[PDB]
Design a protein around this nucleic acid. Structure first.
Lengths: 92, 189
DNA sequence: TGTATGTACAACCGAATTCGCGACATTGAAATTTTATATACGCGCCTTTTTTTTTT
DNA sequence: AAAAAAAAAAGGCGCGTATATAAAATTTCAATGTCGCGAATTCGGTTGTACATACA
């Protein structure tokens, strides 16, 4: 048998927006899971009062995506994935 | 102390499709010589197919380091699987290939009502979740606790005597052995 | 003829000894504490009132 | 039909909001202030063989 061609197009996949958001979302969701846990841990460890809005920092996600769209920076670790759209002429 | 009940109880393990095994969590074997069949108990009529004629090195045991009450039931006599009446079994089989699962309930309310809540709903703690001395009298009590206990701890004396701390220590300073070093630390004997 | 003796000069070994972080205790203090009085609102809670429901 | 009991509800009531004042007595608290803990460090005694050498 021959050496595998590593470029046969079938061995490619295209991480379109969907799977890409998954990456971005999934990891960013961890940053939520850890943090509440952290604060949760604190309030008990100091018997403070369990409030929800302090417990979950919403920005953790919204700020994450909005940024990571706004520039193709994707974490860093990757760039060139988000552009301004090109509205020169329809075909463009 | 392993026990061998029979090790020879001839048994025919079977593999099954999902529905009947699920229905199995009786019948009548109509062997036909070897087109073995089975008349189930009402329901369908599923014959016997000989998945493996001869079955070896495989036996049935039981359970009740730590050993446990283990017995040897018997040897697998012959393996079978099942031929599943048929078209309905065929229909449900192809029908079984048509599962589904939930999508997302968007929120049909307009958004102020949905969004006023997760901010300042004005209502809090709806749920319970992690809601968290005389010089004479002091001396007599200090002598008593020291008489009661040589290891009459000072703060424990203060908590128990329920007297001002300064008065209790003064009582224990002369009526008790003021020990702040050594193995019996914080013990007033 | 077997033995007792002084002394060596070299590699091995373990034995015994003194330095800073954490535990709290320290006293220092503020905060809270209780009281009158007008003001008004808005907590909750008291009793009563009325109503409703049940049974005979 | 009537009595009777059960229940809801209504309303005013008290000092938890504000504020100023004093009184004092408690409580809690924060800011350093002394106590062990494991690591860090240096000294000679023992032993074996040589080698000369002398009494039993």
């Amino acid at each position: 048998k021959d050496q595998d061609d590593r470029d046969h197009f079938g061995k490619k996949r295209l991480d379109l927006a969907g799977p890409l958001l998954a990456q971005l979302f999934k990891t960013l969701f961890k940053k939520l899971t850890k943090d509440i846990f952290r604060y949760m841990q604190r309030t008990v460890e100091e018997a403070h009062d369990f409030n929800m809005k302090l417990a979950i920092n919403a920005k953790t996600i919204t700020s994450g995506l909005k940024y990571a769209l706004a520039t193709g920076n994707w974490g860093s670790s990757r760039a060139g994935v988000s552009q301004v759209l090109n509205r020169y002429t329809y075909s463009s | 102390d392993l026990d061998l009940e029979r090790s020879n109880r001839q048994v025919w393990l079977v593999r099954l499709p999902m529905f009947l095994a699920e229905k199995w969590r009786l019948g009548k074997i109509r062997i036909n010589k070897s087109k073995i069949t089975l008349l189930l108990n009402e329901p369908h009529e599923y014959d016997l197919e000989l998945t493996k004629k001869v079955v070896e090195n495989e036996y049935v045991f039981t359970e009740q380091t730590i050993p446990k009450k283990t017995a040897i039931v018997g040897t697998v006599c012959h393996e079978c699987q099942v031929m599943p009446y048929h078209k309905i079994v065929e229909q449900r089989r192809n029908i079984v290939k048509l599962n589904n699962k939930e999508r997302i309930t968007t929120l049909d309310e307009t958004v102020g009502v949905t969004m006023s809540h997760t901010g300042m709903s004005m209502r809090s703690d709806n749920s319970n979740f992690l809601k968290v001395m005389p010089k004479k009298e002091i001396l007599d009590y200090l002598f008593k606790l020291f008489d009661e206990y040589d290891y009459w701890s000072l703060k424990g004396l203060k908590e128990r005597t329920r007297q001002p701390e300064a008065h209790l220590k003064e009582c224990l300073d002369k009526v008790a052995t003021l020990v702040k070093k050594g193995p019996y630390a914080f013990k007033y004997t």
